Amino acid sequence: GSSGSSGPPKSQPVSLPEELNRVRLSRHKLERWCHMPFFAKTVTGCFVRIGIGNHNSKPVYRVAEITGVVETAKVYQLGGTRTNKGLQLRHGNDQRVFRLEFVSNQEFTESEFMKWKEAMFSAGMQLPTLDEINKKELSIKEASGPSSG
Numbered sequence: 001g002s003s004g005s006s007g008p009p010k011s012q013p014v015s016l017p018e019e020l021n022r023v024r025l026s027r028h029k030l031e032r033w034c035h036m037p038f039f040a041k042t043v044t045g046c047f048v049r050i051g052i053g054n055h056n057s058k059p060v061y062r063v064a065e066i067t068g069v070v071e072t073a074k075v076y077q078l079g080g081t082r083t084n085k086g087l088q089l090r091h092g093n094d095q096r097v098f099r100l101e102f103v104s105n106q107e108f109t110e111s112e113f114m115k116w117k118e119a120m121f122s123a124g125m126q127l128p129t130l131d132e133i134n135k136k137e138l139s140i141k142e143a144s145g146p147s148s149g
Helices: 017-022 027-033 039-043 110-123 130-143
Strands: 047-053 060-065 068-078 081-088
Touching: 017 110, 017 130, 027 039, 027 068, 027 081, 027 130, 039 068, 039 081, 039 130, 060 110
Parallel strands: none
Antiparallel strands: 047 060, 068 081
16 A cells, blocks of 8 residues: 655636536536446546426525545436446535436536535635536546547
8 A cells, every 4th residue: 555645736626617527527428438447537526417396386496516426235327327326426425326318418607606615615725726617527537538529
C-alpha cells in the first residue's frame, strides 16, 4: 500500500450551470458505461439529474454528485437493459442512492444548479472547479464519446 497527495487546485466552482452540464452524466452514457469496467470510477465525480418528484403541475429536480457506485439485490430496467447498480448521489451534506432509471438526461436548469448550490452554500461546501469539470469531462470523452458536434 502507498499514497500521497494534497493541495488546493485553486479554481472556480462551476461559474455557471453549463460547466456542470458538461460533466453531467447521462442515463445513456450510464446505460453504456453500466457495461463498462471504468463505470463507477468514471461516473464517480460526475453529475446526474435526479427527479425527486414531478406531480401534476410543476416538475421537480435536484443536482447530485456521484460519490460512488453501490450494489443492490433487486434489478431494474434501464432502456431495455437490466442493471443493479445504485448510483451513489450526494445532496449537499446528505448522501443518497438512486437508480439510473431515475437519472434523467437534461441540462441543469439555471434553477436546479442554484437550488442545489444552496445545499453547497449552506453546508459551506465547494462545487466542481472548472479545472475538475474539464479534467473530469476529458475522462467522459475517453471513456466513451461518439462525437463532439
